[PDB]
Write a protein that binds this ligand. Structure first.
Ligand SMILES: [Cl-]
Ligand SMILES: [Cl-]
Length: 247
């Protein structure tokens, strides 16, 4: 059954933290950027410095979202708003795009050091879904999704991709809007009531629920009950610590 109802004919996976062991790299890059930006703010304004919490702040405000939505959402949680700027703003600019580019510069530095690794259980699950003849899409906010799927070889399991480039070029609202999962379902030729969503991000689980997908599977690798509770509260039908728990 692969943990799925019989009506499910396709699986939609997030990338970082679901298929590849790359969520900690993104989290490190987000925290390092935001700590430096917030400390630089405190130097300018005299406001109290409060670091970026790589658990609660990442999971609530950043995880899964379009990069610039993650910037705006975390900043808003601190009662900070800055101009959006332009997509090619340098990382030194105090704009939403600038901070996103600053984080992306960080991420690429970390990624070139230690390349993306696949979770063994995720490889097993993709092999099982593929052997069962189910469609597979990857739906991620990360702009590097195509490259990650290529270097890991996971692209051999994936028929459709909606990633950070797709969101920008097709003007698709990111998670927690359901729109990017619905675009992937459409590319796969299935309706949401015939599709399963696999997500480690609270925003992504909420997107799956908002899209009325047949099953929303949350992934909790934190080892803490609190994130599993949040995944269920945000709309996950199933929570696993690893996809192999469904085999
Ligand atoms: Cl990105
Ligand atoms: Cl469960």
């Amino acid at each position: 059954s692969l943990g799925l109802p019989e009506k499910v004919r396709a699986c939609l996976f997030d990338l970082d933290g679901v298929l590849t062991d790359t969520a900690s790299l993104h989290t490190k890059a987000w925290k390092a950027m935001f700590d430096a930006y917030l400390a630089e703010r405190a130097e300018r304004t005299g406001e109290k410095f409060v670091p970026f919490d790589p658990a609660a702040d990442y999971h609530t405000y950043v995880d899964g979202k379009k990069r610039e939505d993650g910037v705006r959402s975390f900043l808003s949680s601190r009662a900070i708003e800055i101009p959006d700027g332009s997509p090619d703003d340098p990382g030194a600019a105090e704009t939403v795009y600038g901070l996103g580019n600053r984080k992306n510069d960080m991420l690429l530095k970390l990624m070139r050091d230690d390349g993306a690794q696949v979770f063994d259980g995720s490889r097993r699950y993709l092999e099982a879904v593929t052997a069962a003849g189910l469609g597979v899409a990857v739906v991620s906010s990360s702009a590097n999704t195509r490259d990650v799927l290529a270097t890991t070889g996971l692209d051999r399991f994936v028929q459709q991709r909606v990633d950070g480039v797709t969101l920008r070029e097709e003007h698709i609202a990111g998670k927690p809007a359901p729109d990017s999962f619905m675009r992937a379902a459409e590319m796969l030729g299935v309706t949401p009531d015939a599709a399963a969503v696999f997500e480690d991000a609270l925003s992504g689980v909420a997107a799956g629920r908002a899209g009325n997908f047949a099953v929303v599977v949350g992934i909790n690798r934190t080892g803490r009950a609190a994130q599993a509770a949040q995944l269920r509260r945000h709309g996950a039908d199933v929570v696993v610590t690893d996809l192999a728990e469904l085999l």
